């Protein structure tokens, strides 16, 4: 056994990042040992979610009957170092022919971040190799002429920014600080935010790109010298924790924090001591979607480079109760690909014409016209490869460490964002 590899009639590549490491100078052209770096529990959960999805589909006698799905999965803690695993999915017999017009895999799920996706997508786009991202929210990926085989199952930053503006307009504060991760995710958020508020009462009073030795003492020094009460923190788990943890440390108080869905469901910060001190945390969040059978799969599961977890001794409970965000996206990504395969093969409800030549670009054509139900949602993508499913909600971190829903974002309504203000208890 390896969790990272499962034989089958057809292979899906799985691009994940189970560990985190900061960028560092290197002098040799070789893969990084990711397995000795800092473990990320909610990422591992998303990893398992894909393994659960493939096993469920292989258990099924109506979706892809008698045609098994396998996978090659990777843990890419570093974008610049992920190319060996990329070459494996794209290779024909462990060889890449640059000028080629049957790759190892028929599609790939992931990656999770805009940065990973920008570094590798071109190699996939050249032959219309389907990438279905479960987390990459960069605006640029809606440009179909640049990324014509790139689909995703989460929404663009545009939407999330709209939702975040919706929250601000619903209340009375109009000076805003905007702290963003010093990367493509963050930077793209800042431009979507600036665009959306140009024609409004909202004024961007302060912004800073957030990185490793951001002097948080001095960021918070100006923020309170400009008397800003509202602070948007648009960043990944690692950067967000830095910001919030520094805030408690520097005793920043009486602020309204606004989170994107990357950390509105953080399970560390709400239980953190002193959290109460910094004011009130609201955010845009993905509603918890219940994926049935996943709990049982986890209990049963806890028992080439970048294909090692190095994570025995895991509390099954701590994985189950980890940040469930992006779960349905991963789930749907795998199913989107399985349905495309199913339809390319021209399967029936109990049989599949056997041993057929499938080409990744045929999967793309079936992927794009995806239209099927899954847990009573409808899985479809628009002309940009963006998803026409998934809600956002507004949460409030309440006195007992829970992210209580207090509102909804409606993509196509007159009042775009609605909030039961009485549920919010203000610190």
């Amino acid at each position, epitope marked *: 056994t390896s969790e990272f590899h499962l034989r089958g009639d057809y292979l899906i590549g799985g691009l994940f990042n189970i560990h985190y490491v900061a960028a560092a100078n290197f002098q040799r052209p070789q893969a990084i040992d990711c397995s000795s770096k800092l473990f990320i529990l909610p990422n591992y959960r998303r990893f398992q979610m894909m393994r659960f999805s493939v096993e469920e589909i292989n258990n099924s006698s109506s979706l892809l009957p008698n045609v098994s799905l396998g996978y090659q999965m990777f843990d890419h803690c570093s974008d610049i170092h992920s190319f060996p695993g990329i070459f494996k999915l794209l290779s024909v017999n462990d060889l890449i022919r640059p000028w080629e017009d049957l790759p190892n895999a028929i599609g790939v799920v992931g990656p999770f971040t805009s940065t990973h996706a920008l570094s590798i997508a071109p190699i996939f786009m050249t032959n219309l190799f389907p990438m279905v991202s479960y987390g990459c929210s960069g605006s640029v990926f809606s440009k179909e002429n640049l990324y014509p085989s790139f689909l995703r199952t989460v929404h663009s930053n545009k939407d999330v920014i709209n939702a975040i503006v*919706g929250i601000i*307009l*619903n209340f*009375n*504060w*109009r*000076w805003v600080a905007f702290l963003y991760s010093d990367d493509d995710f963050g930077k793209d958020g800042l431009e979507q935010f600036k665009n959306k*508020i140009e*024609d*409004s*009462e*909202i*004024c961007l009073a302060f912004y800073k790109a957030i990185n490793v030795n951001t002097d948080y003492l001095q960021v918070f020094k100006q923020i309170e010298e*400009q*008397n800003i*009460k509202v602070i948007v923190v648009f960043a990944p788990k690692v950067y967000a924790e830095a910001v919030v943890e520094s805030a408690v440390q520097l005793n920043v108080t009486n602020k309204v924090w606004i989170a994107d869905d990357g950390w509105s469901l953080n399970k560390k910060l709400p239980s953190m001591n002193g959290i109460q001190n910094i004011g009130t945390v609201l955010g845009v969040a993905q509603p918890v979607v219940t994926i049935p059978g996943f709990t049982d799969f986890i209990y049963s599961a806890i028992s080439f480079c970048n294909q090692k977890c190095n994570c025995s001794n895991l509390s099954v409970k701590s994985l189950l109760n980890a940040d469930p965000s992006f779960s349905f996206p991963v789930y749907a990504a795998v199913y989107a690909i399985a349905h495309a395969l199913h339809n390319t093969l021209r399967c029936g409800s109990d049989r599949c014409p056997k041993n057929i030549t499938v080409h990744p670009h045929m999967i793309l054509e079936e992927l794009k016209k995806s239209n099927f139900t899954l847990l009573n949602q409808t899985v479809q993508f628009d002309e940009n490869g963006d998803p026409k499913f998934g809600s956002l909600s507004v949460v409030f971190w309440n006195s007992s460490g829970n992210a209580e829903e207090v509102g909804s974002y409606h993509f196509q309504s*007159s*009042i*775009h*964002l*609605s909030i039961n203000k009485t549920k919010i208890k203000w610190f």
Partner: antibody
Amino acid sequence: EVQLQQSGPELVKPGASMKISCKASGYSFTGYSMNWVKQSHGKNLEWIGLINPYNGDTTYKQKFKGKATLTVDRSSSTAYMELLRLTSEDSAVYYCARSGRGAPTTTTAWFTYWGQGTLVTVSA
Amino acid sequence: DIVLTQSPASLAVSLGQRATISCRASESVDSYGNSFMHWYQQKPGQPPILLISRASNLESGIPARFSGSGSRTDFTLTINPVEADDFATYYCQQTNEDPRTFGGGTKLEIKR
């Protein structure tokens, strides 16, 4: 150009009610508070209240609670003030005015754009 | 409710000379490092025009002969030099606190 175009002068009977419109153009309607201001002939300016066109939230000066009702219609970019149970004390020029950009709050915002005004005459 | 008292009530200033209008507020109108006092010009039969916001910021489109200053509770609008189309009522306005309130106005007349 930002323009606020108010509805024409009205003559209305005592005890009746009346509705004034403010058509906004040339900016994004839901991003700025719409304020309403009264001016009796004596020419004191009085703030009636404001509405957040994004969600319909309203704030009123206490003496106009249940006198004035502010609403918006987002699809036509139009703000309305309904005046209830009219008396001769309600004969005045009424203005709609848009919050500008730069105030820390919706409360502190000043008025950069005004409609031309609506003269209301309350008489039998 | 913050009460605004302008002085003088009315004023006559010769062309090319300086006009000084005052506003005193019952309570301070300071917050967020600013003074939320603004000045408007209203010619007869027309909506008020914003001249100066937050006590001293000249709005775009307004000549530099209009200016304002002061803080806390005491504010001055200054017009120098007065030109012929400057007769109007000038209203100060505070927005520090709900409800917003206007001063009673100061009536500026051209002396000739």
